[PDB]
Design an enzyme around this catalytic site. Structure first.
Site, PDB file in Angstrom:
ATOM      1  N   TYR A  75       2.318  58.339 -40.032  1.00 25.62           N
ATOM      2  CA  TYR A  75       3.654  57.979 -40.439  1.00 25.62           C
ATOM      3  C   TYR A  75       4.376  57.386 -39.240  1.00 25.62           C
ATOM      4  CZ  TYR A  75       7.814  59.162 -43.516  1.00 25.62           C
ATOM      5  OH  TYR A  75       8.916  59.212 -44.362  1.00 25.62           O
ATOM      6  N   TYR A 118       9.233  55.326 -48.630  1.00 21.93           N
ATOM      7  CA  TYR A 118       9.389  54.083 -49.348  1.00 21.93           C
ATOM      8  C   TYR A 118      10.560  54.027 -50.276  1.00 21.93           C
ATOM      9  CZ  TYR A 118       4.823  52.509 -47.629  1.00 21.93           C
ATOM     10  OH  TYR A 118       3.737  52.138 -46.897  1.00 21.93           O
ATOM     11  N   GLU A 172      -0.591  52.091 -43.410  1.00 19.22           N
ATOM     12  CA  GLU A 172      -1.338  52.022 -44.643  1.00 19.22           C
ATOM     13  C   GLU A 172      -2.691  51.372 -44.470  1.00 19.22           C
ATOM     14  OE1 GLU A 172      -0.387  53.990 -46.671  1.00 19.22           O
ATOM     15  OE2 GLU A 172       1.682  53.833 -47.301  1.00 19.22           O
ATOM     16  N   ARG A 175      -5.082  53.885 -42.888  1.00 21.54           N
ATOM     17  CA  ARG A 175      -5.520  54.923 -43.806  1.00 21.54           C
ATOM     18  C   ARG A 175      -6.558  54.451 -44.801  1.00 21.54           C
ATOM     19  NH1 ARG A 175       0.628  56.229 -45.413  1.00 21.54           N
ATOM     20  NH2 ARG A 175       1.123  57.918 -43.931  1.00 21.54           N
TER      21      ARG A 175
END
Ligand SMILES: Nc1ncnc2c([C@@H]3O[C@H](CO)[C@@H](O)[C@H]3O)n[nH]c12
Ligand SMILES: Nc1ncnc2c([C@@H]3O[C@H](CO)[C@@H](O)[C@H]3O)n[nH]c12
Lengths: 258, 258
Positions: A75, A118, A172, A175
């Site tokens: 994050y 988000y 993202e 990941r």
């Protein structure tokens, strides 16, 4: 804290690939692999000296900005631009205490009143993920918008839109091999496009998938997880097998059984 | 038909390993692998010229016998010893017709009235699998018993006991890496011992496991299969993952989905 550098100036799928590969390498210890998928460090017990990694982004305008990633989830917690530091609103006390160890030398440390999820950011930006374009051009612009916020130059909705871009292209992509793959294609053809349903569903499901895999019976999910194909059609996942080449890192959900 | 030779005389885990490896290589085409596990040829469409492989077994007494394995299931269909040929009772017409292509040159071809399944053979032998010892010594003796049946020398119960041994050390070991592993250990320490519950359950479950795997959802079984550990305790299988290092070949149950 470890620093990884990337520049949008003259970037290529290779320079972008090396970058995401380096981030992954810094995020994980190699100590925990579950069904061939690495698991991120567990927050309980993790020393602050090993809690973050910094990503120094530079662009063609010669502007730099440094994002701070939390190692236990990849994050983006905040960034540093010149003399100032901005942090999303911590969602707990350990976190509010941990971020006090970052950019300790900046002269102006500010903490936004909103968090970095988000939903919040799409609200502040006035557009959804499905509408904000991704590519090297959008990233190049985000580095500047983020940089000029520190000088009164950037507006709130542009700050939010810029984070949404940085988070999908960095966290993202780190990941999911799938999502990093979508970025490599944008870069190769110099396209700039909004993410399709497959990208978005994967983003939304990272935590559920990390739990389902970690609590699967020999890799079998107790209940299927429904995802979407690029063309918007639903597609059920029943086993961790189909995800091995899709998901790159998992958030720590539980200890592995014997 | 391809012939593979093995001799119990001075056998070692290595010579036994090479043997089982060669059998596997002859049984399968490499054209069908499902979750990293090879599937045996499908009986429908398979030409007789590619229906069998022969295993020529020789022992320290310098006696030889040739077993015939059906390629679609690794089942021992019959054997040749000197001038005679014996075949278990075919369970259908294609099979009764296929075996007419084997040992065509033997002068005396006989077809038993009983089939070669374990139940039948344990009945004819007067002992169960759990009681018949396995090892190189038992195999050495089986080659002789099978050989002397052709000369009035072997009794019916000894013929049956000898087949039970040959089938587990050849067909069953070729199907399961687990079972081949149990044989390698008997050979290494020159032990001679009856198979434990793990071996027997695997033998009993080969067809169910082959179907469960082939009709699994991304490798997940619709319903678990219960097996047993060496110590007799039950152990459920929910995914093909735990079996990858246990099962070596599968009987063709169905076509693979897209
Ligand atoms: N600032 C941020 N950094 C990283 N991921 C997120 C997210 C995404 O939403 C959820 C979380 O796990 C991640 O997939 N929202 N905001 C984020
Ligand atoms: N003559 C024979 N050859 C091979 N397998 C068997 C069996 C075993 O019983 C069942 C079949 O698939 C196999 O696992 N019984 N008789 C056999």
């Amino acid at each position: 804290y470890p620093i990884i550098n990337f520049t949008t100036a003259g970037a290529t799928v290779q320079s972008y690939t090396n970058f995401i590969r380096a981030v992954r390498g810094r995020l994980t210890t190699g100590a925990d692999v579950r069904h061939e998928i690495p698991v991120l460090p567990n927050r309980v017990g993790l020393p602050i000296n090993q809690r973050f990694i910094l990503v120094e982004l530079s662009n063609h305008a010669e502007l730099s900005v440094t994002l701070a990633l939390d190692v236990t989830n990849a994050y983006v917690v905040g960034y540093r631009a010149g003399n100032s530091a901005y942090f999303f609103h911590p969602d707990n006390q350990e976190d509010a205490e941990a971020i006090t160890h970052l950019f300790t030398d900046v002269q102006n440390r500010y903490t936004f009143a909103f968090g970095g999820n988000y939903d919040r950011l799409e609200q502040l930006a006035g557009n959804l993920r499905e509408n904000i374009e991704l590519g090297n051009g959008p990233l190049e612009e985000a580095i500047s918008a983020l940089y000029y916020y520190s000088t009164g130059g950037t507006q709130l909705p542009t700050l939010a839109r810029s984070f949404i871009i940085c988070i999908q292209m960095i966290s993202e992509a780190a990941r999911f091999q799938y999502i990093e793959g979508e970025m490599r294609t944008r870069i190769r053809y110099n396209r700039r496009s909004a993410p399709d349903p497959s990208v978005i569903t994967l983003e939304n499901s990272w935590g559920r998938l990390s739990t389902a895999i970690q609590e699967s019976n020999q890799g079998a999910f107790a209940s299927p997880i429904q995802l979407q194909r690029r063309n918007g059609s639903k597609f059920s996942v029943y086993d961790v097998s189909i995800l091995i080449p899709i998901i790159a890192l998992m958030v720590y959900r539980c200890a592995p059984p014997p």
